[PDB]
Ligand binder design. Sequence first.
Ligand code: MYR
Length: 288
Amino acid sequence: MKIAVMTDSTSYLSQDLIDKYNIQIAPLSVTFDDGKNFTESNEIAIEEFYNKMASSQTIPTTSQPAIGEWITKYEMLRDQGYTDIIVICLSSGISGSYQSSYQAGEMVEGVNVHAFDSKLAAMIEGCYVLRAIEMVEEGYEPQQIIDDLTNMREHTGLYLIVDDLKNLQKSGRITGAQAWVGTLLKMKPVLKFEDGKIIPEEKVRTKKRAIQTLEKKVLDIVKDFEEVTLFVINGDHFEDGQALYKKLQDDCPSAYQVAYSEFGPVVAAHLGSGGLGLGYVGRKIRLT
Ligand SMILES: CCCCCCCCCCCCCC(=O)O
């Protein structure tokens, strides 16, 4: 028995972790109305996508990985001795990458495909990947890993801040004058993930209190966990994510695992500019 672990590109793992563990990636795409397509990878210039997103008069569309992209890596991993494949996917409540990962694995013979619904995104979804690899090396069989990843999912979440009432209007969720009810007013909607779905939490003015809202909300949850792994997931506002990341290191004991990361074009296409999140895991995930 040999078990492999792969995922889609929305888990935004570091290129070091991908290269070290040979993690195969099924990329998501984002197509603008200009005809230009950005296939998610660690080769694009994220700053130039943000400029293109601000350039484009309309917000682009997102697409899950093509079924053929899942197949070629599935049959590849099979064509090297892997008896089982664990697939951590983007949350099925927000995307169709989990549906395509299951159906494509049914069309690949010789290996047992195990699609997992992360019920989240970004490095929090990537934490499931690093936890699956850690268990495979320890000598765990697939359903033992899925049972653990299902248990880890019960103590895992992510809050996020949206600072782009602009981008919220070109998508049709707020009217033209509603942007001029928050932008001048500096109102920041605060959302959170629940059961794989993005539901509204609070609407805190100023980004500072909204960031302080993220800290107090996540710290009050993880204070009852035996193991804690925090992840600052920042957008194109570098100073905002670092201020929260540094404030966390000062306010949290070193027993807590505090990490920094950034999301890519697919997640940014829906968040816009200045997006910022804060996720947590009830486990001491191996990030090395
Ligand atoms: C930084 C906080 C994480 C925010 C995650 C936003 C996810 C919403 C975008 C949904 C992407 C759907 C992808 C697809 O079309 O298949």
